[PDB]
Amino acid sequence: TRELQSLAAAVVPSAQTLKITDFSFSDFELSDLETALCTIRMFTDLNLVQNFQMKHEVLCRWILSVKKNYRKNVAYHNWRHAFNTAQCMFAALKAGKIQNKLTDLEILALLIAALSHDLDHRGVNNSIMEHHHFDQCLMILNSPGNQILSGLSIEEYKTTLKIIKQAILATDLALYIKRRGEFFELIRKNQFNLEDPHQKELFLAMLMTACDLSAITKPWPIQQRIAELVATEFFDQGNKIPSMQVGFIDAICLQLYEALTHVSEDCFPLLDGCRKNRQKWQALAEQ
Ligand SMILES: COc1ccc2c3c(c(Cc4ccc(Cl)cc4)[nH]c13)CCNC2=O
Ligand SMILES: [Mg+2]
Ligand SMILES: [Zn+2]
């Protein structure tokens, strides 16, 4: 309540002053309260606040519920990873100019899903998990005081909930590797068409995974610090890394950021940043 009062009172600096439109954004210098402000600006500047009549103290309270239900004790899968996933969704919608290709309910759902998609993760060494993450998400969404979708009609609410759930489930990398063949497939034959409801849902999944993974695209000093959190979580349950990093980039990351660059050439900095990191890791791998 002490934290909610400060949060609700504060003025929310512009998207420019917060730097949330940059693919190279980083959160290391922000306090919990500042990521909260960044989050309101994301909602506000996607015009989700007015278009769905969100009340300020509810949105505020909803963000703090989401943040609280990530575990500070987990070195990487925590609020900051979720906050960063949402910042990249924001950036890809704005700077990557993907906003225009989607509808309001899709965008509302993507942002809620990005922020919620790992709720209550306890660490890799501790599609079962994603169903739990969605469960948390919905629970918080229904808590009185946090109900940021209350201004949506029942039909809007039902559509938005379905997309949210699909988007969070899509962050299972096993689901991503199962489905990306089809996605890459349609891009290489210039058959890709967002107006097909199946390809729309497919793209939304792939965009969720690209945001989820996007620490791998950051500028080298930021990305290397994220890598330390990953190594901490995976090893310490709390020489070999450069080749793992190259193996992960090749097996999981590069094609996705390549495909996404075809759907919108303004997402190229994610591909660019991924590429720079691969070469820098490769260099280290050769000792
Ligand atoms: C900047 O790098 C990374 C940024 C983000 C992620 C990841 C992963 C990896 C692979 C890995 C795992 C353990 C170790 Cl020890 C090394 C390498 N690297 C990542 C999987 C975890 N999901 C991620 O969001
Ligand atoms: Mg996850
Ligand atoms: Zn995640």
Do residues 110 and 46 touch, judged by C-beta distance below 8 A? no
Q: Under 8 Å CB-to-CB from 141, ≥6 apart: which residues?
A: 62, 112, 147, 148, 149
Do residues 59 and 52 touch, judged by C-beta distance below 8 A? no
Instruction: Look up residue 150 and give its two tokens.
Output: 């209350």
Q: Which residue has the tokens 């489930």?
A: 169
Q: Under 8 Å CB-to-CB from 31, ≥6 apart: which residues?
A: none
Instruction: Output the known binding site for 3',5'-cyclic GMP.
Output: 245
Instruction: Look up residue 133 and give its two tokens.
Output: 């993450």
Ligand 1, atom 21, residue with closest C-alpha: 230
Burial class (CB in 10 A: 0-12, 13-18, 19+), 22: middle
DSSP letter string, 250-264: IIIIHHHHHHHHHH-
Ligand 3 centroid to Cα of residue 127, in Å, is 13
Cα 158 off chain centre by: 22
Structural domains of the chain, count:
1
Q: Under 8 Å CB-to-CB from 275, ≥6 apart: which residues?
A: 254
Residues with catalytic function: 77
Name the amino acid, one letter, at 266: D
Which residue range(s) make up the domain with 159? 1-287
User: What is the DSSP code (8-state) at residue 192?
Assistant: -
- Ligand 1 atom closest to the CA of 248, numbered from 1: 10
C-beta of 252 in contact with ligand 1 (< 6 A): no
Q: How far is Cα 2 from Cα 260, in angstroms, rounded to an integer? A: 42
Q: With CA atoms as reference, report the closest residue to 227 among 216, 214, 238, 213.
A: 216
Ligand 1 centroid to Cα of residue 135, in Å, is 25
Name the amino acid, one letter, at 226: I
Do residues 85 and 211 touch, judged by C-beta distance below 8 A? yes
Instruction: Look up residue 250 and give its two tokens.
Output: 């090749």
Which among 230, 233, 235, 284 is the best mutation to test ligand 1's pocket, defined by most ligand atoms within 8 Å of the CB?
230
Name the amino acid, one letter, at 218: K
Q: How far is Cα 70 from Cα 211, in angstroms, rounded to an integer? A: 18
User: The dihedral of CA 262, 267, 269, 270: what is its sign?
Assistant: negative
Cα torsion through 51, 66, 92, 219, rounded to 10: 150
User: What is the DSSP code (8-state) at residue 196?
Assistant: S
Instruction: Look up residue 23 and give its two tokens.
Output: 């693919």
- Ligand 1 atom closest to the CA of 235, numbered from 1: 15
User: The dihedral of CA 40, 43, 44, 49: what is its sign?
Assistant: negative
Instruction: Output the known binding site for Mg(2+).
Output: 118
Q: How far is Cα 222 from Cα 88, in angstroms, rounded to an integer? A: 14
* Declared resolution, Å: 2.2
CA-angle at 86, arms to 119 and 257, nearest 5° = 115
Ligand nearest to the CA of 83: 3
C-beta of 224 in contact with ligand 1 (< 6 A): no
C-beta of 4 in contact with ligand 1 (< 6 A): no
Q: Which residue has the tokens 């500070």?
A: 72
H helices within the chain, ranges in order? Answer: 2-9, 15-18, 32-45, 48-51, 56-68, 79-93, 104-116, 128-142, 154-170, 173-188, 197-212, 220-234, 241-248, 254-263, 268-285
SS3 assignment, position 13: coil
102: left (phi over 0), alpha (psi -120 to 50) or beta: beta
